[PDB]
Amino acid sequence: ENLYFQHMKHGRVFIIKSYSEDDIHRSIKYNIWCSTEHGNKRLDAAYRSMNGKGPVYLLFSVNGSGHFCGVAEMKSAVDYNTCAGVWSQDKWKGRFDVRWIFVKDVPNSQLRHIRLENNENKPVTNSRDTQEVPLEKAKQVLKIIASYK
């Protein structure tokens, strides 16, 4: 048995949807990310209120790819005044640190049965960028990602 993810009552988990394979590569290389203005605010608020008592996990997926491409932990608050033009969208304003945990493709078929009660019971695979995942469903997603081969 694998009971690791069942025993943890803190932590928050968000879906990250990227249009750009380049941005994913840059994020893995440099352990940084940036979302939209409203996405950055949502993640910043979550990281800050955690105050280090548990992780903020990011579940990454490229729009249209049909799979998740990995998992990272948020590792800093959002710095909103950084060098412009480092990403796909040249307007994107800001940067936060991440630490990539798992880099592997996980097909949407492995995950489409998990549904989000905070997003109209839609499959977790049909989420938009910075959709939060309820912790009890996030445990199920993380276990599937960690045991897929």
Author numbering: 400 to 548
Which lines from the publication concern this structure?
The YTH (YT521-B homology) domain-containing proteins are a family of RNA-binding proteins that specifically recognize N 6-methyladenosine (m6A), the most abundant internal modification in eukaryotic RNA. In contrast, the DF proteins (DF1, DF2, and DF3) are mainly cytoplasmic and play essential roles in mRNA translation, stability, and degradation. Our study focuses on DF2, which is involved in multiple types of cancer, including prostate cancer, MYC-driven breast cancer, and acute myeloid leukemia (AML). We have also presented the crystal structures of DF2 in complex with six ligands, which represent six distinct chemotypes (compounds 3–6, 13, and 15).
The X-ray crystal structure was solved for compounds 3–6 at high resolution. In our first screening campaign, we described a series of uracil analogues; compound 4 is a new member of this series with a modest IC50 value of 250 μM. The six binders 1–6 belong to four distinct chemotypes: thiobarbiturates (1–3), uracil, nicotinamide, and pyrazolopyrimidine. Despite their chemical diversity, these chemotypes feature an NH group that is involved as a hydrogen-bond donor with the backbone carbonyl of C433. Furthermore, they act as hydrogen-bond acceptor of the conserved water that forms hydrogen bonds with the side chains of W432 and D528. Notably, compounds 1–3 occupy the bottom of the aromatic cage with their sulfur atom, while compounds 4–6 have a methyl group as in the natural ligand. Compounds 1–4 and 6 act as hydrogen-bond acceptors for the backbone NH of Y418, and they also form a hydrogen bond with the side chain of D422. This interaction may offer selectivity against the nuclear reader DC1, which features the N367 hydrogen-bond donor NH2 in this position.
